[PDB]
Amino acid sequence: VASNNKLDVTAPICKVRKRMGRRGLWIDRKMTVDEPLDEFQGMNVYDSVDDANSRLRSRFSFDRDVPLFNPVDPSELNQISSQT
Amino acid sequence: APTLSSLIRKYAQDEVPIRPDDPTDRDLNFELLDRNKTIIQALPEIYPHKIADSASLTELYYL
Amino acid sequence: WLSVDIMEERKFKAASCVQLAQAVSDYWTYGKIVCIQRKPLIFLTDEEIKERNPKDEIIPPALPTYSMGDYKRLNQNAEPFKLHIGLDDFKKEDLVLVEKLPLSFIFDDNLSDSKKKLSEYEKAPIAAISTLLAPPEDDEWYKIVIRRDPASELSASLDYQKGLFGAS
Amino acid sequence: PQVYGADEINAVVLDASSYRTKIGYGSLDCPILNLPSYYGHQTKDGSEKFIFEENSMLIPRPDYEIKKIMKDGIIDDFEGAVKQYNYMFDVLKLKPSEQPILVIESTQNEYEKKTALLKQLLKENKFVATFLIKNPTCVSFAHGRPNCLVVDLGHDLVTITPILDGISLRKQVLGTHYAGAFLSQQLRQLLNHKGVEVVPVYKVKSKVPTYFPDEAKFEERKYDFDISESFENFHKLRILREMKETLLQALPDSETEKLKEQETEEDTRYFEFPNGLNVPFTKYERVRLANSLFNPSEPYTGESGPNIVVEGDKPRGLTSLVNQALNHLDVDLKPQLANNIILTGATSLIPGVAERLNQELTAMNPGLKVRIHSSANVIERTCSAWIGGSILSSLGTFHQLWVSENEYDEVGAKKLIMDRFR
Amino acid sequence: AMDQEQNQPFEENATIDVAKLL
Amino acid sequence: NKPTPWSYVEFSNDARESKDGLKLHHWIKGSSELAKNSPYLFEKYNQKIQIPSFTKEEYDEFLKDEASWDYDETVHLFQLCEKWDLRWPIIVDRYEYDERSMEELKERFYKVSERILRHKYRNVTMDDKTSLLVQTLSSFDKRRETERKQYLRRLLSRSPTEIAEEESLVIEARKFELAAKKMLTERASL
Amino acid sequence: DVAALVIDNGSGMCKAGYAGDDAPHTVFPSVVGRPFVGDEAQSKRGILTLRYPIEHGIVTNWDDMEKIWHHTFYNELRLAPEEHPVLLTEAPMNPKSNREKMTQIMFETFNVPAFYVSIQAVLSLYASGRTTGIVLDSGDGVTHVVPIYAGFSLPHAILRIDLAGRDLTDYLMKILSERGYTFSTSAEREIVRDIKEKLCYVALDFDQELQTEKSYELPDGQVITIGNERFRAPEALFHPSVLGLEASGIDQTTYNSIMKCDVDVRKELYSNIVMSGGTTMFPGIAERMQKELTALAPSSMKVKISAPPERKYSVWIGGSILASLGTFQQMWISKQEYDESGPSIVHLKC
Ligand SMILES: Nc1ncnc2c1ncn2[C@@H]1O[C@H](COP(=O)(O)OP(=O)(O)OP(=O)(O)O)[C@@H](O)[C@H]1O
Ligand SMILES: Nc1ncnc2c1ncn2[C@@H]1O[C@H](COP(=O)(O)OP(=O)(O)OP(=O)(O)O)[C@@H](O)[C@H]1O
Ligand SMILES: [Mg+2]
Numbered sequence A: 001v002a003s004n005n006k007l008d009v010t011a012p013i014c015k016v017r018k019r020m021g022r023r024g025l026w027i028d029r030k031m032t033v034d035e036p037l038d039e040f041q042g043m044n045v046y047d048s049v050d051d052a053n054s055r056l057r058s059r060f061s062f063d064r065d066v067p068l069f070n071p072v073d074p075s076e077l078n079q080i081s082s083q084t
Numbered sequence B: 001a002p003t004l005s006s007l008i009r010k011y012a013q014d015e016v017p018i019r020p021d022d023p024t025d026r027d028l029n030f031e032l033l034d035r036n037k038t039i040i041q042a043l044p045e046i047y048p049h050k051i052a053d054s055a056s057l058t059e060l061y062y063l
Numbered sequence C: 001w002l003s004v005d006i007m008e009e010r011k012f013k014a015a016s017c018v019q020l021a022q023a024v025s026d027y028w029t030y031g032k033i034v035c036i037q038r039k040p041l042i043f044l045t046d047e048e049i050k051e052r053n054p055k056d057e058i059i060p061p062a063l064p065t066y067s068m069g070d071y072k073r074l075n076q077n078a079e080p081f082k083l084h085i086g087l088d089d090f091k092k093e094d095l096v097l098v099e100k101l102p103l104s105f106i107f108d109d110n111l112s113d114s115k116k117k118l119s120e121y122e123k124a125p126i127a128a129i130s131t132l133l134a135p136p137e138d139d140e141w142y143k144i145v146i147r148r149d150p151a152s153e154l155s156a157s158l159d160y161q162k163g164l165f166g167a168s
Numbered sequence D: 001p002q003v004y005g006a007d008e009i010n011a012v013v014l015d016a017s018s019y020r021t022k023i024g025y026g027s028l029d030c031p032i033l034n035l036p037s038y039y040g041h042q043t044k045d046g047s048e049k050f051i052f053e054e055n056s057m058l059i060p061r062p063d064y065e066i067k068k069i070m071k072d073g074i075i076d077d078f079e080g081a082v083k084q085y086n087y088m089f090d091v092l093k094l095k096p097s098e099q100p101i102l103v104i105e106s107t108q109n110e111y112e113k114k115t116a117l118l119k120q121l122l123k124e125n126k127f128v129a130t131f132l133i134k135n136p137t138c139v140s141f142a143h144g145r146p147n148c149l150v151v152d153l154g155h156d157l158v159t160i161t162p163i164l165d166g167i168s169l170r171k172q173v174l175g176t177h178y179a180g181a182f183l184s185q186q187l188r189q190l191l192n193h194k195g196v197e198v199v200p201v202y203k204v205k206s207k208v209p210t211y212f213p214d215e216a217k218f219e220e221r222k223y224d225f226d227i228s229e230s231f232e233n234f235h236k237l238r239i240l241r242e243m244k245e246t247l248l249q250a251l252p253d254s255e256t257e258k259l260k261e262q263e264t265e266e267d268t269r270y271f272e273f274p275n276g277l278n279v280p281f282t283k284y285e286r287v288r289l290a291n292s293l294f295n296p297s298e299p300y301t302g303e304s305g306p307n308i309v310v311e312g313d314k315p316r317g318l319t320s321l322v323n324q325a326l327n328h329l330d331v332d333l334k335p336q337l338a339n340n341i342i343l344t345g346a347t348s349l350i351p352g353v354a355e356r357l358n359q360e361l362t363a364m365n366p367g368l369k370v371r372i373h374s375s376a377n378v379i380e381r382t383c384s385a386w387i388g389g390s391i392l393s394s395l396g397t398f399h400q401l402w403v404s405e406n407e408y409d410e411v412g413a414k415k416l417i418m419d420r421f422r
Numbered sequence E: 001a002m003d004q005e006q007n008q009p010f011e012e013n014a015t016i017d018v019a020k021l022l
Numbered sequence F: 001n002k003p004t005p006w007s008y009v010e011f012s013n014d015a016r017e018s019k020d021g022l023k024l025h026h027w028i029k030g031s032s033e034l035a036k037n038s039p040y041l042f043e044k045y046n047q048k049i050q051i052p053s054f055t056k057e058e059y060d061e062f063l064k065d066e067a068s069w070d071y072d073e074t075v076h077l078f079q080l081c082e083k084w085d086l087r088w089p090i091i092v093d094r095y096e097y098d099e100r101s102m103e104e105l106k107e108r109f110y111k112v113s114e115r116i117l118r119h120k121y122r123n124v125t126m127d128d129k130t131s132l133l134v135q136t137l138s139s140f141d142k143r144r145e146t147e148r149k150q151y152l153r154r155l156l157s158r159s160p161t162e163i164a165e166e167e168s169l170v171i172e173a174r175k176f177e178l179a180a181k182k183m184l185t186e187r188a189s190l
Numbered sequence G: 001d002v003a004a005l006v007i008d009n010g011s012g013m014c015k016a017g018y019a020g021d022d023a024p025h026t027v028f029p030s031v032v033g034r035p036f037v038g039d040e041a042q043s044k045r046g047i048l049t050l051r052y053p054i055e056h057g058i059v060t061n062w063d064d065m066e067k068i069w070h071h072t073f074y075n076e077l078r079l080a081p082e083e084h085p086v087l088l089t090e091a092p093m094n095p096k097s098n099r100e101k102m103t104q105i106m107f108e109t110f111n112v113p114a115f116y117v118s119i120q121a122v123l124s125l126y127a128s129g130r131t132t133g134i135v136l137d138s139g140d141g142v143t144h145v146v147p148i149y150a151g152f153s154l155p156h157a158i159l160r161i162d163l164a165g166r167d168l169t170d171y172l173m174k175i176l177s178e179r180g181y182t183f184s185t186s187a188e189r190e191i192v193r194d195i196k197e198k199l200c201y202v203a204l205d206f207d208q209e210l211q212t213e214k215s216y217e218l219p220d221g222q223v224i225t226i227g228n229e230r231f232r233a234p235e236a237l238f239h240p241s242v243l244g245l246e247a248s249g250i251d252q253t254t255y256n257s258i259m260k261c262d263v264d265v266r267k268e269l270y271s272n273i274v275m276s277g278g279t280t281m282f283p284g285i286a287e288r289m290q291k292e293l294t295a296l297a298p299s300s301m302k303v304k305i306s307a308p309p310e311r312k313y314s315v316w317i318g319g320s321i322l323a324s325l326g327t328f329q330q331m332w333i334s335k336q337e338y339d340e341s342g343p344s345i346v347h348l349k350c
């Protein structure tokens, strides 16, 4: 972990299973690297782009192919910042 | 030329984290080398492909 | 098994249907160019009625999990994905990878004794009372990684070509 | 070949949820019909006429009333419920005496209702096979996790039924009455305070947009007959449905901090009723309305949504309800249910409720990894129960549990069948 | 029973669809 | 080049108890001349967990063993354990005789009854192998577990600060772990 | 590659042709009379009684629909089924047993190498060149509304209407009878059908035109005069009260269906509304449908009806377009798949 010398194992190129299914064989996948996410008078609610983005961000935020960062660190439980 | 306050504010803005399963400029640089020198390994997602050497903290404390 | 099958089937069906819709849209814009080259029509005579991938063990993959709302934005690497691979060769390189991967979520372990798959939280004597003590999810997936052959790192004799002289 | 595949029997899967009933076939993926949990009634003529198709109810009729059936997840007005079931079977063109029927129902149900339902399904419709799987187990079947904590957020009842190894825990159910109906009544009384009068869709015949809060011009098409109050209420239910769909948004208890700022940003939205009155809604009102699910801070009695306790001093709210449900579980299996939380319910589509629910659960329950599982696809959230019913009916081994008409007669008493064969 | 219309506005009728597709 | 006709057929005996002829139609490949294929598949899995039972006569061997146990409670427990495939929380939840019965009390009573019956059943001909091995494990103890459950609850009830400190200690311990070799070499050189 | 055959089964008549063509080769009523097949059999009304193998989008009797495919295969198009893949159409919310039986019958009797079913309404939407939009499909027997999202018919949003061309034809029969001209003959009923084909047009508003004539000669030699039936009949489609049916009108059904869908799609769905079906090509339908929907629609969004001139065979045109596509060639149900997995394969890939 310290030495920056070259190692002989690369990052996971792809993730795949081999599952039989009623149609026939399948090879499921998730992305190895997470996407950057969110790549896309009083205003009426339908025309509100921000509200639609909020809907499409909350609806797709808990069953993603790759979970969020959500690190297991004691900073949150101590009510203080990770730096401090 | 950012001001002094701009620098002290930036370091408090956390840091973009690099996931363990992500190319980190420390890899095989893909199959640039010969195919005869490359081996394909299929591991379950549970187990780790790379492991770092370590010795039990009790051993370190005693030594 | 059937539940994973149903989820992946729904995702694959959505992907295939939206790909078909995009193909229709592309046809209606660039022109009959993407249409098939057509073949001659074999008309038969009245006498004849008087007597009277796309092929080979196909292995269709499945889409990643974003379902419907996010997917018309077409999160793609650079091109439409491969939703049908029936040639089955896999350039002859990935064929062994495909055929020798364990099938996942198998109902019957090929009649090998009886056996019983337990909950992963039941294997662990620890009760996983802490966040760090979480045992593996066990989603039955295989990661693929390429490695440098250990034999390649081994020392080998020098190989070269002699010039006019220098041999022996 | 190894029998990885499941065998499908063409068995119809029926549901009787609080707001909508979703019939469908065995091995398919989506329900064929989903009628709302209401049945019409007209008695203008000497005879009696029933209107059950969803579209045909919405039109005005001279003497017409709409009566609810699914009160709180338990079957009520069984005489009309069987008529609705028979009509729904007829529309689907189902063939009786050759198709098993799987019937889903809530965790809590009267024994007499189960007996009547099974007797009618086995002796009147002449169905060969039947079964009664509990709804939370069926939802767990839909999401594929056999060890999970189902947390429903439906229209009438919020139900949290722990499930161990694929079967529900009957005594561990926590039923709170603060649900979509609470939001409906609260937003109705907010509209009442602001003086806005919501008009039905059928009344509007010619209208023009008017963004001013004052009254707007809307030509009214007046019929000769008189319209019942229940008809108007059912029509207004739709408008509240889109208005809850669009306006609501929840934030993690930071409403008091940006209470002052929200008026400054002027981020208000407009909801255009069929009348045309584009009522402005300040972001504070929407945020409080959404958060009311998690803490019933409204002291106006909620318009017949009174104080309630588990299995129904202060209403607890969703997050503390989930915490209480987790606490009562034995420590042997508590992490297993904590790490697998399945959150169904159409009201989950409100943005931010699940995220802040996860935040509150992980903050108030330290050291226990709480990961909340939901569904990206809308059809999976809306009709998870029918998905589970379909997959259970398609399962091969499950077929040794069907309750037969001859078996029902030989056993006779429904008590023996219900306890063992469910 | 007659053919009303056609509309193959080939933005690219080049025979290489990726002439504009790419 | 024509496909094997698939045909819809009646099917039967998924080995349901009761011997009723529920016929549930399923689609099958080829003519079912092999109809009356009594091994309808899925009967292979009609496996039932076996638990030796006790009657009124055998309660004499069980007579010696706020408990207030009796014949009715024991037979109710055994019927519950036979119906539900020994899942302790579901057994205690579906239990309805009286509410004072706690998880470990049920577990201990079931284990001691099982071991006593089995020993009384290996008395004439000595038991070995698998059965002796189960007898061995069933030398349990109810006190240890309540201690285990109480300990687990106490750990789960700790304050956020203490558990955050524990997590930080584990993280720092692993961080110091990952660089043991370099530290050891430097210490040796020094 | 080969040429993919396309056959469309409508209630009024069957449509069949060839992939890539802009018009079907043959159009026959698909009526079966058991004592022949086709309109020639329909002519001999005496010994054999006419009957509809397909009715309300559901096959009443397969033993005549087999003759229907035999007639449309060997006597009208006259190709080789044993080598040519066949595409067929089917009404939505079709019971699964019918689809299983249809797939089994085709793959067994006809030995079709590749057979793929699809919703006729989404095929119609594949015409007019837009991926999304409500399809207000209305055949001779059944009216459908299918909010389509990238071709995937949103399963919860389909609504079914019993208002049909035959019902309004019977209403025309009744109003001609009350006018004083009774037409008992079925041929006379078809004459009335043609009469409402030509002169009937959709009124902008029922009451304004009501307070405000045309005559066509019957083929036998007598002229018939009708004054209010020109506009009364199209409004009967909007208001089924005169028909006596409890079903709602077209506008109310469309509004309910569009509101049942998701909110984020409704914006595009309103703008990309598509209409089809031979029943709804009545002149003046577009402006009335537009004005009523806009009256019931939110003011922020824009309503745009897109009535096409090719309504009568738009479903067949879309089906041929889809079949001619190269990417669609992978979707076909191959013979070996049907042999391996049985008829239940249709619900998995179609
Ligand atoms: N996007 C949405 N967000 C929030 N509420 C919605 C949304 N769409 C519809 N609703 C309303 O929220 C309620 C959710 O009812 P839902 O269909 O989930 O209940 P159900 O099927 O009767 O089952 P149960 O009440 O037993 O969970 C209904 O009143 C529905 O009209
Ligand atoms: N020129 C026309 N003028 C008026 N009505 C017409 C005209 N042409 C066709 N129709 C109506 O449309 C019907 C023709 O059938 P249509 O094409 O609408 O449905 P289909 O596709 O055959 O059937 P379905 O979709 O119900 O299976 C006629 O019976 C008539 O009601
Ligand atoms: Mg409900």
Ligand SMILES: [Mg+2]
Residues within 6 Å of the ligand: G010, G011, G138, G139, G140, G277, G278
């Ligand atoms: Mg039609």
